[PDB]
Design a binder for this molecule. Structure first.
Ligand SMILES: O=S(O)c1ccccc1-c1ccccc1O
Length: 344
């Protein structure tokens, strides 16, 4: 059987199972989305498509645009190096030092931080979701400033390009695939240039990109990776029709991912290498961006704690008017598959 697929720059068992041969052994092959069919990463408009990535796009698709296209198979938390970075030689060493300083943020984050979404509800799926992705910077800045007893009104917001948030349709369509290596090349080099421009004092970085940025000689004012309130819930989705029409196939898919997750615990280097190649980053940056022993936490989850994390992100979207009505997570989830896999 052949399924189309994609994954965000996050640790996940779908990519692991595919590159390690577990899917092949299960008689399943995956074809990554080309740049020309890349919008599916945000719309889920395909009959046999599966994605393991950030939760914002699927929450918007299910809760705002097209209820019913997907089912949730599992969750894998994400937490690692994260925060507003400054150059090592910067006199800024504490959160309080950000008072009155120039914070570089995406146009999307600026809409959210100002509480002025503009034409948000009238935008097409791709551009609309990109506005919501400004949430990462927005929440991170609020939490960072809290440490210095400051608020957003205490700093200067300056527009800059942020990876994953600023992705023009032309850029997407020109990319060979939606793999991080093709869509997000040399991110840290670009962020280091922004910090060297003389027009900004700090900017948001995370994922392996933050690891490479740190290597250029930069540091986070506050490492948000040290506090769980900055974690996100990566989600694994699949076309709803496959769940209803081909449960046997979905079960084989989930079994393979679970086996790959167990296997990963004893093959840390191989797992680090395959994620690094998929995203186009150094192997050392993977560990910094996802956490030292992320390979021990790759078996997908649907327990109460994992669902609460996903709900937390959803609430940030609702509070900030990026969603009007919430997605019923218990209905969206199809726990039977993961439950059967873990009972083997
Ligand atoms: O998928 S998102 O949640 C996501 C999460 C984290 C980093 C990048 C993206 C992303 C943004 C735009 C287009 C493709 C992407 O993978």
């Amino acid at each position: 059987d052949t399924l189309t697929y994609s994954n965000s720059p996050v640790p996940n068992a779908l990519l692991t199972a595919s590159e390690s041969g577990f899917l092949d052994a299960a008689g399943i092959e995956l074809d990554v989305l080309s740049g020309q069919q890349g919008t599916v990463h945000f719309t889920y408009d395909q009959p046999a498509y599966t994605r393991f990535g950030g939760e914002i796009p699927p929450l918007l698709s299910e809760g705002l645009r097209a209820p019913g296209r997907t089912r949730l198979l599992g969750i894998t938390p994400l937490l690692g190096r994260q925060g507003f970075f400054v150059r090592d030689d910067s006199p800024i060493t504490a959160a309080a030092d950000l008072a009155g300083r120039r914070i570089g943020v995406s146009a999307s984050a600026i809409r959210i931080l100002r509480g002025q979404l503009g034409d948000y509800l009238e935008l097409d799926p791709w551009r609309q979701t990109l506005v919501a992705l400004g949430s990462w910077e927005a929440r991170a800045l609020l939490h960072t400033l809290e440490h210095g007893e400051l608020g957003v009104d205490d700093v200067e917001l300056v527009p800059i390009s942020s990876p994953g948030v600023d992705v023009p349709a032309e850029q997407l369509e020109e990319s060979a695939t939606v793999k991080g290596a093709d869509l997000f090349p040399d991110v840290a080099r670009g962020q280091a240039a922004v910090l060297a421009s003389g027009d900004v004092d700090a900017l948001y970085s995370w994922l392996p990109w933050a690891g490479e940025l740190q290597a250029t000689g930069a540091r986070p004012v506050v490492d948000l990776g040290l506090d769980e309130r900055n974690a996100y819930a990566s989600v694994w989705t699949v076309s709803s029709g496959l769940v209803r029409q081909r449960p046997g196939l979905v079960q084989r898919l989930v079994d393979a991912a679970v086996d790959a997750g167990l296997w990963a615990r004893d093959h840390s280097d191989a797992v680090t290498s395959l994620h690094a190649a998929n995203l186009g980053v150094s192997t050392g940056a993977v560990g910094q961006g996802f956490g030292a022993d992320f390979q021990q936490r790759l078996v997908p989850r649907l327990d109460h704690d994992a669902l609460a994390l996903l709900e937390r992100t959803q609430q940030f979207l609702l509070t900030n008017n990026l969603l009007q009505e919430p997605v019923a997570l218990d209905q969206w989830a199809a726990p039977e598959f993961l439950n059967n896999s873990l009972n083997r």
